[PDB]
């Protein structure tokens with residue numbers, strides 16, 4: 001809830017993207033992706049509570065957003081299988097991460113908002 | 118053609134946005150918007166030939182893209198009346214400007230690529 | 235605070251865009267733009283309290299975001315003079331409007347999130 | 352060339368993103384990512400010639416754009432390790448795919464333009 005938040009918006013309907021599956025992975029020493037956390041976006045398009053300060057150590061993380069299932073639910077043919085946002089988490093003050101995604105059937109945009117309390 | 122080019126893409130269909138009206142204005146000495154050029158995008162989503170090197174002097178220009186008529190023709194009631202850029206041109210000498218717009222019913226993005234001849 | 239909110243993000247620094255001037259206009263019967271509301275974004279990149287339910291009637295509105303002054307404050311040369319988000323406000327249930335903008339020096343993206351309480 | 356093209360733009364400088372590494376993978380029968388093609392963007396920010404009509408069969412493809420090396424070379428420490436698309440190709444017969452990426456240090460967007468030959 002504190003260190004890693006995801007927010008997803010729908011650019012076709014001008015709304016939060018609701019009930020979107022989100023999977024978070026951390027890169028392991030053997031360079032495979034290890035499941036870390038997951039959830040579904042809320043009615044406000046948000047997913048909180050994925051991890052804790054103590055669990056969210058420096059490392060390379062992947063946030064996969066299942067955009068294809070979302071567009072299929074709406075009856076709209078999409079391009080992407082999903083979105084895959086990959087980043088290194090870096091200590092340097094008590095940083096929080098918000099991964100924002102804006103979805104269209106044939107385009108997505110993702111931004112990171114990195115702040116301090 | 119070369120000095121000012123517009124490209125418009127549809128993020129719902131993954132296609133050029135074809136036959137989109139584009140109106141260009143230039144700010145006059147009395148701080149009003151004067152008509153400068155207009156046209157429609159081609160089957161490739163592009164609009165060339167709006168102006169010339171001789172005509173495209175220093176100034177503040179506004180490019181208004183009629184996105185609402187575009188979406189309405191496809192059965193969609195969009196949020197915005199139009200997409201735009203407003204920019205100062207040729208401040209440090211002539212440049213070539215490509216204005217790219219990416220359209221969704223409730224979102225748009227406008228990007229400039231500026232090249233030195 | 236309720237019916238019209240603006241949120242601005244900085245894609246270069248991964249942060250809220252703070253102290254950005256925002257001006258809202260409503261189109262008048264003579265097709266000129268009449269000042270309606272204005273403010274600066276907060277430390278969270280947000281601007282609330284622009285209008286009230288009673289004041290925010292159907293009409294055509296323009297939200298201008300002074301992006302050029304923001305980039306100038308950061309010492310970064312920008313393309314746009316500002317962003318100009320123009321839309322019709324439409325009754326049909328108790329709708330709220332959030333105008334979100336994502337800023338880069340040579341590109342901006344704007345989305346509308348339109349919801350009900 | 353014709354079947355799969357990549358274009359990369361820099362939203363900080365308003366320019367093509369030049370000499371950006373691009374790696375393409377194809378999902379194999381055993382659900383692993385197999386190397387398919389790679390290259391670097393030209394002075395126009397474009398990468399052509401990755402594959403052919405004969406080689407580019409139905410499949411799930413991943414295009415990984417090395418945006419982190421790009422930003423680092425310009426003195427910028429960016430948020431993301433790379434930009435990507437993952438997509439199913441040629442499901443309803445051969446198509447021509449242009450993958451466009453627009454880059455900022457803490458944000459990227461990937462758009463597909465899909466044309467029927």
Ligand SMILES: COc1cc(/C=C/C(=O)/C=C(O)/C=C/c2ccc(O)c(OC)c2)ccc1O
Nearest residue numbers: 098100101102109110111113250278334336343
């Ligand atoms: C104060 O800073 C923060 C802001 C936010 C954002 C909240 C929010 O409601 C977001 C928004 O309203 C929209 C964000 C946005 C805008 C344009 C885009 O292209 C996009 O996708 C890449 C997303 C989330 C967490 C924060 O810490």
Ligand SMILES: COc1cc(/C=C\C(=O)/C=C(O)/C=C/c2ccc(O)c(OC)c2)ccc1O
Nearest residue numbers: 133161162217219449451452453460461462464
């Ligand atoms: C001529 O029309 C076509 C264009 C293209 C592809 C690319 C092209 O010229 C695009 C461009 O020159 C600009 C593309 C663009 C615009 C906005 C963005 O946010 C973005 O990044 C996600 C990219 C592909 C097929 C076409 O038929």
Ligand code: NA
Nearest residue numbers: 207208209210
């Ligand atoms: Na000059």
Ligand code: NA
Nearest residue numbers: 441442443444
């Ligand atoms: Na087929």
